[PDB]
Amino acid sequence: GIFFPALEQNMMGAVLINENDEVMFFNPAAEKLWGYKREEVIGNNIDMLIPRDLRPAHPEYIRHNREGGKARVEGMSRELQLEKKDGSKIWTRFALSKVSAEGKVYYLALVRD
Amino acid sequence: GIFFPALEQNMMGAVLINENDEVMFFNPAAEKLWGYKREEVIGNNIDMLIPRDLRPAHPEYIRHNREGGKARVEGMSRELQLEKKDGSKIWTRFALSKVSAEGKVYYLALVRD
Amino acid sequence: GIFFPALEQNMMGAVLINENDEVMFFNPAAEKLWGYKREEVIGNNIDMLIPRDLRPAHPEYIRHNREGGKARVEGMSRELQLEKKDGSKIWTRFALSKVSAEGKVYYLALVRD
Amino acid sequence: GIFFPALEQNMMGAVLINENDEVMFFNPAAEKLWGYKREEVIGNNIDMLIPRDLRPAHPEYIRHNREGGKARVEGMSRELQLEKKDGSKIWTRFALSKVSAEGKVYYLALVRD
Ligand code: HEM
Ligand code: HEM
Ligand code: HEM
Ligand code: HEM
């Protein structure tokens, strides 16, 4: 198994959510970006990782994409402001990928900056 | 599984080389970037993916890094000019990670643009 | 002239905001999209066109971009949920351009769907 | 004059043809999409911008529309294959608008992808 270590030790933050938008994977790089320990994120709705002023609109965007059945995801290709646990904000770059695994719709977000 | 699909179907090209600098993984995103189908890459040396005019210097950079036993990789942090099989060139963004597994040092390059 | 007619009679909604984020142009295509007649938009702030739940976050995104002096705009590259005057919502496709003229920074949004 | 700069610096390729289907405006974005410098296009028939295997049928479609007097243009609303100067092809999205200016029938094509 080299794929897990590749994402686990990746320099970029990696966030993987399942079909119900729940976090199943959150690597150390991601821990440093957000300010949350992985244990505080696993199993929780992706909502807790979204900035407070985007939480109201975000769920509509995942919903729309899942209902789109399109293998292509072009979203979040720009600079986005990530809100940390302590409330401070930093600018980042996101690379979003829709992932069909175990016969379900997964999303992987690789983050940096 | 979940991790293999996360890199295989990733929007970013993914290239994994083992301890012998041989390409172990090369996703579809990477095939489009370089112009090589996976069959032409897997099992071959990393040098076939390095632009011709940088092939003379690149081996020393990976070697220097492997001998450094450091868990981090600061290199390739900026835009790199990628050269395709047909010779055309495109600018790209690289995210390089050193991956330790089963006692050996691997490298995973995530690419975009 | 030829350029004014090209945007005025364009099948795509066109919205131009000046350096003060005030709407300077709003074509008929845009009136149909939003549900606002031009008289209700021209001279007002861009926020009246931003869905209510995104109004809190949108100002920081334009500001961050203006402070970036970059000629490109990578944002809004994906489907956005537009909110009409009556409150109904429709999904749209945006094409955003930063326009430099007479020493000031303007933004032109071309919309469809 | 903000309308010219808005089309001139637009992210989308912009192609404006006059009553005799001759190109009068061709922006930098359009130069990158087609592979032709603007100087090579101005004054020439739109024909040079049409894929070789569509050149025979295209003229019949503009003809038909001009003879239609309808302010509505629904054509080319899908994905179209654009043929570049070097002959390679890419898929694109077109937004076509019929423009009545200076008392004549103009067409503006905004392109992306
Ligand atoms: C700092 C945190 C994050 C912010 C600020 C953020 C922001 C946004 C915004 C503004 C949109 C709609 C506009 C656009 O597409 O650009 C969006 C869409 C979306 N986001 Fe996020 N996001 C964040 C994290 C995530 C994570 C961790 C995932 C999942 C692993 C995710 C998955 C999605 C999906 C699936 C969409 C819809 C895709 C589309 O736009 O076509 N986001 N996000
Ligand atoms: C488009 C192809 C590529 C180009 C143009 C390229 C270019 C370079 C350059 C210029 C350096 C030294 C300067 C710097 O760090 O910025 C470098 C270092 C390095 N490259 Fe590449 N590279 C390419 C692909 C790869 C791939 C596919 C891997 C492995 C998965 C890789 C692994 C490394 C390593 C380990 C180093 C030394 C690490 C460090 O700088 O700290 N490179 N590369
Ligand atoms: C239906 C209404 C609109 C919605 C829902 C909307 C939504 C958004 C969102 C979610 C972002 C940040 C994430 C991203 O880039 O995808 C954004 C950024 C931005 N928007 Fe809007 N927007 C709307 C209308 C406009 C208009 C009319 C203009 C100006 C003519 C505008 C100018 C900008 C700029 C300059 C940015 C930052 C640029 C960048 O992301 O690089 N937006 N907008
Ligand atoms: C990559 C280049 C282009 C391709 C492949 C292309 C292809 C086509 C095709 C297949 C049709 C007929 C079927 C349909 O309406 O979908 C058409 C119609 C038309 N095209 Fe194009 N076109 C191109 C560029 C342009 C440009 C640059 C203009 C003008 C600024 C233009 C103006 C028109 C007009 C006026 C019609 C008739 C409208 C209608 O279908 O009702 N086309 N084109």
User: HEC states along chain C?
Assistant: CCHHHHHHCCCCEEEEECCCCEEEEECHHHHHHHCCCHHHCCCCEHHHHCCHHHCCCHHHHHHHHHCCCCCCCCCCCCCEEEECCCCCEEEEEEEEEEEEECCEEEEEEEEEC
Alpha-carbon gap, residue A76 to C77, rounded angstroms: 8
**Pair of tokens at residue C17:** 């905001």
Alpha-carbon span C73 to C106, nearest angstrom: 12
Pairwise CB contact (< 8 Å): A91 & C64:
yes
Q: C38: Cβ–Cβ under 8 A, 6 or more apart, which residues?
A: C26, C27, C28, C31
Interface residues of chain C, partner chain D, Cβ below 8 Å: 1-7, 9-12, 16, 24-25, 71-73, 95-101, 106, 108, 110, 112
**Contacts of C among chains (3+ CB pairs under 8 A):** A, D
The pair of three-digit structure tokens given for residue C37, joined into one six-digit string: 């007649």
Is residue C30 within 6 Å of ligand 3 at its C-beta? no
Residue that the structure tokens 């905001």 belong to = C17
C53, C61, C64 ranked by CB distance to A57: nearest: C53
Report the alpha-carbon distance of residue C55 to residue B94 in Å, rounded.
34
Sheet holding B104-112, edge to edge: B23-26, B13-17, B104-112, B89-101, B80-83
The Cα-based distances of C70 to C66, C74, C77, D45 in angstroms read 8, 10, 16, 35
Number of domains in chain C: 1
Burial of B41 (0-12, 13-18, 19+ CB in 10 A): buried
CB–CB of D6 and C100 under 8 A? no
Beta carbons of C97 and D9 less than 8 Å apart: yes
Query: In 3-state terms, chain A is what percent helix, strand and coil (to 5)?
Result: 25, 35, 40
Residue owning the nearest CA to atom 41 of ligand 1: A75
Identify whether the C-beta of residue B107 lies closer than 8 Å to the C-beta of residue B96: yes
Measure C46 CA to nearest chain D CA, in Å.
17
Q: Which of B2, B9, B12 would you mutate first to test chain A, the one with the most A CBs within 10 A?
A: B2
Residues 6+ apart with CB under 8 A from D58: D46, D47, D50
Which run of H or of E encompasses A64? helix A58-66
- For A107, the 3-state DSSP assignment is strand
Q: Does the C-beta of D105 come closer than 6 Å to ligand 4?
A: no
C-side interface with A, Cβ within 8 Å? 51, 53-54, 56-57, 60-61, 64, 74-75, 77-79, 81, 91
Give D61 Cα–ligand 4 centroid separation in angstroms. 7
Handedness of CA B100, B103, B105, B110 (dihedral sign): negative
Question: Are B83 and B92 a contacting pair, CB within 8 Å?
Answer: no
Instruction: Compute φ and ψ for D44, nearest 5 degrees.
Output: -90, 160
Name the β-bridge partners of C16.
Answer: C25, C108
Contact B16 A2 (CB under 8 A): yes
- Residue D31's H or E segment, with its range, is helix D28-34
Task: Check: CB of residue A11 under 8 Å from CB of residue A29.
Answer: yes
C70 CB-contact burial (10 Å; exposed 0-12 / middle 13-18 / buried 19+): exposed
Q: In angstroms, what is the C-alpha Rg of chain C?
A: 13
Residue in B77, B70, B90, B102 with CA at minimum distance from that of residue A12: B77
Structure-determination technique: X-ray
- CATH number, domain with residue A111: 3.30.450.20
Q: How far apart are CA D96 and CA D70, in angstroms?
A: 13
Is there a contact between B97 and A16 if contact means CB atoms under 8 Å apart? Answer: no
B49 lines ligand 2 (CB under 6 A): yes
C36: domain range? 1-113
